[PDB]
Every structure is written in structure tokens, then in C-alpha cells.
Paper text:
SapA was successfully crystallized in an open (no ligand) and closed conformation with an endogenous ligand in the binding cavity. As a comparison, the distance between Asp 222 and Val 435, residues that respectively reside near to the termini of lobes I and II, are 35 Å apart in SapAclosed and over 40 Å apart in SapAopen. A transition from the open to closed state requires a 15.6° rotation around the axis bisecting domains I and II. Conformational shifts such as these are characteristic of the SBP superfamily upon binding/release of their cognate ligand and have been described as a “Venus flytrap” mechanism. In SapAclosed, the lobes enclose a cavity with two narrow openings to the protein surface. Difference electron density (Fo—Fc) became apparent within this cavity during the later stages of refinement. This additional density was not observed in SapAopen. Identical RNA binding was observed at the same site in both SapAclosed and SapAopen and therefore did not appear to affect the overall conformation of the protein. The antisense strand is provided by a SapA symmetry mate. Furthermore, although definitive electron density is only present for a 19 bp stretch RNA, inspection of the symmetry neighbors indicates that the RNA strands extend across asymmetric units, forming a matrix within the crystal.
Important for NTHi survival, colonization and persistence in vivo is the Sap (sensitivity to antimicrobial peptides) ABC transporter system. An essential system for NTHi survival and persistence in vivo is the Sap (sensitivity to antimicrobial peptides) transporter. This multi-component system uses a periplasmic protein (SapA) to bind and deliver substrates to the heterodimeric inner membrane-associated Sap permease (SapBC). The Sap ABC transporter is completed by two membrane-associated nucleotide-binding proteins (SapD & SapF) that hydrolyze ATP to provide energy for substrate transport across the bacterial inner membrane. The structure confirmed the classification of SapA into the Substrate Binding Protein (SBP) superfamily, as was predicted from sequence analysis.
Numbering used by the authors: 35 to 133, 163 to 560
Write the structure that this text describes.
Amino acid sequence: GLTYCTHASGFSFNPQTADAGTSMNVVTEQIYNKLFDIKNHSATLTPMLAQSYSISADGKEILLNLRHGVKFHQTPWFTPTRDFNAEDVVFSINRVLGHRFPYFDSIKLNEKIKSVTALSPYQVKIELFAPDSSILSHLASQYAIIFSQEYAYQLSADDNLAQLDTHPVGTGPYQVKDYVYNQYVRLVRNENYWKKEAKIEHIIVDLSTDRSGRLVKFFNNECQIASYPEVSQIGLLKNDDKHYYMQSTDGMNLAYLAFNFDKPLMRDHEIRAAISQSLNRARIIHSIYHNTATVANNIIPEVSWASTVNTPEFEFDYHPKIAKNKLADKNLLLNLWVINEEQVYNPAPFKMAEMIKWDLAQAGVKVKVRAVTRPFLTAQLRNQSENYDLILSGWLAGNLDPDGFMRPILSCGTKNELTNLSNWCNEEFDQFMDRAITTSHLSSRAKAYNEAQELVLRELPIIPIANVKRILVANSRVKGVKMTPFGSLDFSTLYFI
RNA sequence: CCCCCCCCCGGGGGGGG
RNA sequence: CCCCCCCCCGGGGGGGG
Ligand SMILES: [Ca+2]
């Protein structure tokens, strides 16, 4: 057995309905498979539930050839009577097309895909409205998990369709044995997996502790891997210890401040720029993240294939004297909302808020900080009653296609209320993004994404603060631990020496 | 039941990073 | 880590008894 300690914050057996950009979803990446995985900087598609695919010459039709012989989990709540096939893919993709899903609604997946049909039991046809170079990447994201149509059918007969997300059935290398809300998930190896079996038979995912206590549990041998350690407690760790080791990874893990474009005073570009210039972001990174983050003058991370070498100068970096000149006379009062949760991209949200409140005080701007819960925030956004000026947030992604993160955060939409906290709509921005998916040439796409990014850093609908590393500590008895920019920890490769 | 062919997985070996 | 080639095994599919 191995115990893996992580945060309970926004844990779910279903990321399609969870909040976008908050989690690598370590548990559901073990129990469900996708049609493809992307594992590398180059954006190679690894065949998973699809063995292969073709694209039509006009680029509007994709054929998925599904792997034969794949089994869904035999659990106490479900006995499958057929193998995975096209019906499962059609059910799964059709559900999110709507033929509330925050990620898919934020990318507007139903304005990309026209239909999804089974040509045969082992071949699916996707047709698009127009050529779209992003589609296969979205189907390789953590959100695009394939469910069991047979299970969903059985449950619909007796009304219990909610149980799809409470008692999971997947094709992945682990299955759910049992769990206790906010305490633990017990995983057991799938003995009928379609690829190399997981080496460790039993895995407990411990959710029951805050950052402080996770290293306590680790050194008291209550868990053998521990995610997202406290940052002051990394100072207590060494690299050359025989008994444990650390790993850390870059990726798409961004803390940022969004301006509410619904507030008339936030529309003034002079105000946003001066507010950006009031912030001592270097002080913030040093003081909150220590060494686990760098100041972010870019939306697109350097590990992304879309990243343009030459990180320029940010025109609105710390300059407290210019900020004070522009702001002091306006007698500004800003409401700053902070989400009261553990966040992969911000270890001390309130402490960061207070530092922002301080920096803006020096520029003569009064800030009232307001702690808020995810449920409260979610309700207000769904209800369009949100009345913040600033909100402190972030984005986490294992998918480094900018269509999968820049679009949810900043694109026009009516059904992107959970992800676009700026309430920002810019036609010029949206044209860059739409151009970026009309070609399959990486450099061509990158150019379009860099033009979009450059526009964002001029307009300042958000202020980027920090690119945050993901860290874990592992017990030296454990091998096969690979932390990567490109997804969650794969439990199936863990083993004991 | 058997025999071709295709495909996928796993394992072993050899060659090249 | 990976990628070819070979062998063995397992599974699926197609064709022929
Ligand atoms: Ca809104």
C-alpha cells in the first residue's frame, strides 16, 4: 500500500462539472482514460482509448479508431457486460456538447464540434463547423474523460443518474474501492487493464489535512508521498537526504489579479496601468512563495510549445512613484475579493491581498479586502451579482495549448462566468485566438497566441503575478515518481524498492 | 476445432539514440 | 525515457476451411 497526501479543496470524481483551472485531478486521471494523452513539450498525441485517427483534407472531419478489448471496472455497484466502444465516446462527448460544464462551456466546445456519431462499434466520427487545430488537444485534457454508457443507461432507468459521479466506473489502471467525503479515497489496481498493470495494488489518497500538517504526516510515516508542502517548511528540507527527496515542475500554474470591466472606473486604462505599477511583485514573490515561484510577465509559460523566446519588458512593472502620481488624486476605493481556499498557485492568498492593499495605500488607493468562499463566489457569478473591483485568482492546467487556458480566462462569452472574472470582451483578442486555431503549424499558432498575449499585457484585463512550481516530497523507498508540466502524477508507475 | 492476415497489449532479445 | 527490428505469449477483428 501507498498513501498519498493532498488538499481536499475542490476534490471531485468528475472534472467536467468541477471548476476549471483549479486542480490536476490526481484521482480521476488514475480511474478514467481519455482518447489521447499529451505527455511532452512537443505536443505529441499518445494513443489511449483511440489507437489512431485521421483528419479529412478539408480538416472538418476527424475519425477516431478505438482500441479493441478495453474493459470498464467491475465494482460492487456495477458489472459491465460489454467492452468499451463508440457508444461510450458518443455518450461522453455528447453529454458535454449538451446533445453545466465549466471548462467545455468556457472553450465553447459546441461551437467547435457539430456532431459526434458512431460509424461502427470501433470508429467515431467528429465533424466540426470549421477546421480547428485545438480539438485533439482538448480531447487529451484532464476534462475529456470517457464514461460508461452502459452504466449511465442502467442508472437512468432507476432515476439515479447522480451516482455516475458518486460511484465511478472507468477504464483506468485503478478503480475506486471506497471513500469518505473530505477524508480519503481508497484505490485498488484494475486487474483487467489494457496496458501494463499498476505495480502497487492499494493506494489511499488522504485528503484530510492542510499544508502545515502534510509534512508532519509525511515524517511520521502516515504517507509516503506528500503534495504541495508549506513553503516555510521547504526551508526545513535538504536535497541530499537519504530518507526522502523532492521533485518540482514548472507548467501552467499562474496567480493573477483580474479587473472587473463591469465597474466603470476599472475601464480607465490609466487606472489599471497605475494599479499594476503600484504593485511590488518581486517583494510579493519573495515573501509568499520564497523560491518556489518567479514573477510572471507572461501568460503563456516557457514550457509551452506556444511560448515565444524573448520574454520582453513588461511596461507596467513596479514603479511606485508613477503609480502614486496617477492614482493619489482620484481618491479611489477598491473592493478586492479573495477566495478562502487552498490554491495550487497561491499558498497565502490573504497575506498576498494584504500586501496588495499596502502597495496601493502608498499610491493613495484605499482597498477593502473581502474573504469569500467558493460556493458564495460561484453563486454570485451564476447570478451575475458579483460587485468586486479586483479579484485575486489563478489558473492551473496540464494542457499547455493556449486555446485551453487563455480562451476560458479572457474570451467573449455568456457561459464563461466562472472562468472570465474580468468580464472582459475584446474582438481584437478573440480574432487572434480564432486565427490561432485555423492553422496546425505550431510556429504559426504561436505567433497568433503571442499577438493575443502582447495585447493582454497592453490592455491589462488581468495582472499576472506569479508562475508557481508544483512540488512534492517522496519517501526514498518509493520509485517511479515523475512530476511533469504535462499532467498529474501517474500512480501506475509507482513502486517500492 | 483449425489455418492464414491485420491490429493491440505484455515479456525477452538485438540495434540506434 | 524513447524509437526501430526480431521472437514468444495474450486478446480482438477480418478471410478461408
Ligand atoms: Ca459575469
